[model samples]
Target: QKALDLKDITSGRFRPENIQGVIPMPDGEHYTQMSADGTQIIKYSFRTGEKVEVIFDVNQARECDFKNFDSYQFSPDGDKLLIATRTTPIYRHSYTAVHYIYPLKRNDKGVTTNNIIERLSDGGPQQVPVFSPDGTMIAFVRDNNIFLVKLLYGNSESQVTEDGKQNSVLNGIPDWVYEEEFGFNRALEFSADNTMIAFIRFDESEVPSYSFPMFAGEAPQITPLKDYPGEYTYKYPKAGYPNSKVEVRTYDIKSHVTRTMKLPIDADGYIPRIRFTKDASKLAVMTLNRHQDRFDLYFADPRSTLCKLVLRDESPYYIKENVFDNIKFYPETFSLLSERDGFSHLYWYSMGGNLIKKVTNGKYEVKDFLGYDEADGSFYYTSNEESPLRKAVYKIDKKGKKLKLSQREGTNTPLFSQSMKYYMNKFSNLDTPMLVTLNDNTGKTLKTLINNDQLKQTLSGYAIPQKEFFTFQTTDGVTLNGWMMKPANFSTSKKYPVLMYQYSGPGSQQVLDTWGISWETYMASLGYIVVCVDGRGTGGRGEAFEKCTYLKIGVKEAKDQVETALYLGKQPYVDKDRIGIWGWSYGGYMTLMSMSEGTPVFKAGVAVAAPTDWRFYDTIYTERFMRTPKENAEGYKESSAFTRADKLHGNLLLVHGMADDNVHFQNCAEYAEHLVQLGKQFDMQVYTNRNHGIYGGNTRQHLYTRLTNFFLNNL
Candidate 1:
């Protein structure tokens, strides 16, 4: 074998074909996939690796059908599919999608007459529609209110709750903060018997208001709103502001009555999840305190409106987001990830919340909770136990024996079959492209799913950089983890400018073992060292370490990032005075804070869709850290980037989407106004009618190009 050369990599001669999305079928032997040209849904054999049949050919669809679908959900009996089309995303994790019901099984007349898809609601499209376990009912949300469709009664529809209205009463779905912070889209679920429905009602009318302007742009432009220059308003509780009032409720389908569960929680707490268990009477509801240090699992009887606290876990700071999202309920035992033992570990509990035993205890974080084989008394999961920067799937036996399931040395993630006996493993690394495979439980490869070997060989010729991970202890005794990417050239004798990137939100981990793509890799090709650091409030570290910024958002985080830049500045190969910083959202705010932290460490910086002040953010997320501004005035003031705008020591650029409702254009507008008032010289680029992601058609590519050009020109 010959050594790979770097210069051959950057010429753009090795562009790999984009991969298609996959949907596993209920049939254990097959999976569904979109056509290679993206015109139809085809089924493939999981064991044979061949196309089985055309499940839904686009050309065969009846009247008012779509050319293609972005997402699909299978009905309970697997006889129909909800084809999602015409999706309009609202925020970072919120969107409205028009859905069609297509029958997979033919009718008696040999015709698939599932009928033309009707609009779910007139208020707008819906999100995350879920079919009842019996397949007779479908529940979805429109304008925050849940609506149900009953196919047995001529597809009759009715509003489950009329109280749902924007920025006020949100029924059956989470508001902005819950979706982003809790990592969930739908908040409504049906009981196993389908007699009642339970959901989270968010009263966000008390939260402060935030608005952003919208303008016209390319690709299906909204001419009416653009011509009149409209503003989009929503209830956004910033840092140090009161959050929305949340509670769990159940509605009886026959009685048409709504009842609230008597959950023992603080008035300022949050209800993060409400899910139906195997028992028709039991509904699992998860709650967390404002500081995120305490989590309580309440088992409530949906019929009786009675609740029991089955589990409680409290930490010095906030709980990890994984604790809520990854908790798996089995027939007798449930598994959850917690850092109670000073590191991320998995623990098994009885359905009643009694601790059965610690499933896996270690010094490293368990990244994912795979599933438990009840018959064998063993569990499967992925962890960064061997290396914090890398991940591997592992299996633990009933005797607490741990074994690695992956043969490769890079990152390995598994998507298991419903039976848990087989899995689809996705493997990747900085030096290797993604290689996917189907494997048995014991790590035996059954089939080659996708080996991106050609792409890897294609990337080998590029002038790629070497990525290294390192950690440094700050003066404050906090150890921060970071990664650096250096150009593939011998340059110890020459000084190279550095660009720092991060997403420093609470419980966020930016310095992981995965390969660096996006602008980070692109900038390295232009001869700049790209660095990313996880500061005080980042995840992967213990709860105490991650919550050090509580009630004081940016203070410790900014200090540590500044220290990182200073440490890098002293390196022999780094140009100390030419270092710059940039980030989106929280990272963007930190970029501003680091540039003006009373020390001239950063030479240039960029902030995109950043919340300049905590008082300008959403309720559930902001109040969880900083409490209310009425009680923490000084903390809020100290954390505000606008407060330090005049002390900025670097060339700065502010980027924002005119219609960014999540972080709000107010962040950019207020910060820019402050800079203007201080007579500070900076630059800005605003995308018209773009949301927080700043992506639509060419928007993402253009944004990346702008970011690259900015760093190339300024750094």
Candidate 2:
């Protein structure tokens, strides 16, 4: 057996290879995937897993720059591909990149050869580019402005919105808070006939600006700050602060006119998403108030910009972000997920917003909605009806007869074809790595796409410990789920030090049945037992369990984590006085919360990029859980780690990145200053210019080593 180093762990050699960048073809018989080197886009038969053809090859293209592409998007008709290259990541989910248009269909437009790869625009890099319906045009964002490129019109590029300015106004793309919290980057849509374009614009001139200084370190988390430093700045709105003023607008491609939609929304309202319906005149707009408890779906006229509310959903707590993932727009009607019945289920409605049926019903949450087959009236979705800890795919017929499609009992994520005739399912459990299989509509496995035998062989070369699942009821009578990784050579006769891990975020799960290997495995190899628990606010269960931390979010989560440490300390093979806990982001927030929870069980801990106070967090995410600091002052005070700093009872090490854009470094500065005032002794590690992940170059290597050494010495 060999010892795992930080470099080895960072190389991702222990990870199972899984299929990615797959686009199900319109034929429903084949799918396209980028090659490992990204030089070719290859087509394959979904059933037989055999190569059919090479759709695009960089070697054959005439004007293709760079050998490999970063990512690619297929047009709605699959006649062309929008290839992206040299991508510059702006935030968590947004990037600006150079693009090229390559024609794929040979006979449709009388294309001669695959050498037709052409530059999208001569202007500059673009963001959130979208292809027109006929694949003859593209609209992309650059410098906060929307620009259109007509392929047939001599590749003519024109600026559609001229008022866009950095940090002031944005068109066809979301601002920082919306992109980060709303979980989307693009905000523009084209009509069915490609006659008009509709997008959400953000007037963020009133928003506050946040700035941090950078250093001369290229890929700089490992190197120290030296020489004259650079500075980074952006707009960030804290809780209860003013967000970007949003408005919906439409642009006519033919007439070149712009009009604003007339929808009655609150002054502080938010337009989360907007899309064009099959009816060329109708644009679907989903809006939310500042508090986010109420969601309104409206259909607006693209020309007149007149809108009418189709349906409205109000929740007792707040709407979950994933609810938007399943909102499917059909030719005549639509479907969405609602927790009004106390659990997330599929709800169908007509084009006029009339309720048709509750497609899915039960106590279990519908994890994903595959599609609704109009011919058979079958609703295909994946849910945890078997158990909250496991996921299974199922199809409910027109008559409401439900049939389980996936047989494996762990977690099944299925990718269905356009016709739903064939689907690919990736299933795994605590022991199994990722195993992907293609199946027909009847749920019979057609072929194994990947079994990860190579990864298993790689795993066998090392003495990796087995992860065992268990459950424990806290003294408060709540049965919580957890998993533990013990030393490979563990024995009950000898006590061993323990390391506890948890995310403890709202609607999140860490104590899952899925197979995963992390730094925790390497830590286990060092003779420490690693454990993780899913607290009250975590997901997979019903809303009653998930929303238990509604007003006071982190308080219950912290209590549950403390309960985990105390419970594990009682085990025969654990050293009760030597247990330590660590986490990142919200998990980091929970680390501090658990350490100072007043139980005094943890001996050492680390909190990386932790949010010290909810008041310091962004508006959309923080307000959804705890409302506003002004309204729920008591809850904010109780949930924040600042109020509990004096009760902290652990050898704590705080880690943060100075240039963290999401969770600002101010969270670290404030907490450290507060602790210093209390005369509390602790250790700190700050990366020069790293973000929330604190990665790039040798950063993760240095970080894991720091964490590993901190526990080895302190515990």
Best by TM-score: 2
Encode model 1's per-residue lDDT on 291-343: one tens digit a residue.
77889999999878899988889886567667787788876768888888888
RMSD of 1: 3.8
Ten-residue region with minimum lDDT total, candidate 1 = 1-10
TM-score of each candidate? 0.90, 0.97
| Candidate with maximal lDDT | 2
Model 2 poorest ten-residue lDDT run: 219-228
Per-candidate clashes come to 15, 0
- Please write out the lDDT profile of model 2 over residues 1-715, one tens digit for every residue: 7666557778776778787778888888888888888888888887888888888888866767778898998887777888999999999999999999888866454542355787888888999999887778899999999999998899899889999999999998999999998899999888998888899999999999988888866663324456567688788889989999989999999999999999889999998899887788889999988889899999999898789999999998998878876788888888899899999999988889999999888789999889987779888998999887899989999899999998689889999887788888899998889999988877899999899998888878888878998999999999999988998899999999999999989889988778977899889989999998999999988899999899888898998888888898999999999999999999999999999999999999999999999988999999999888999999999999999999999899999998899889999999999999998899999987889989988889899999999999999
lDDT for each candidate structure? 0.79, 0.89
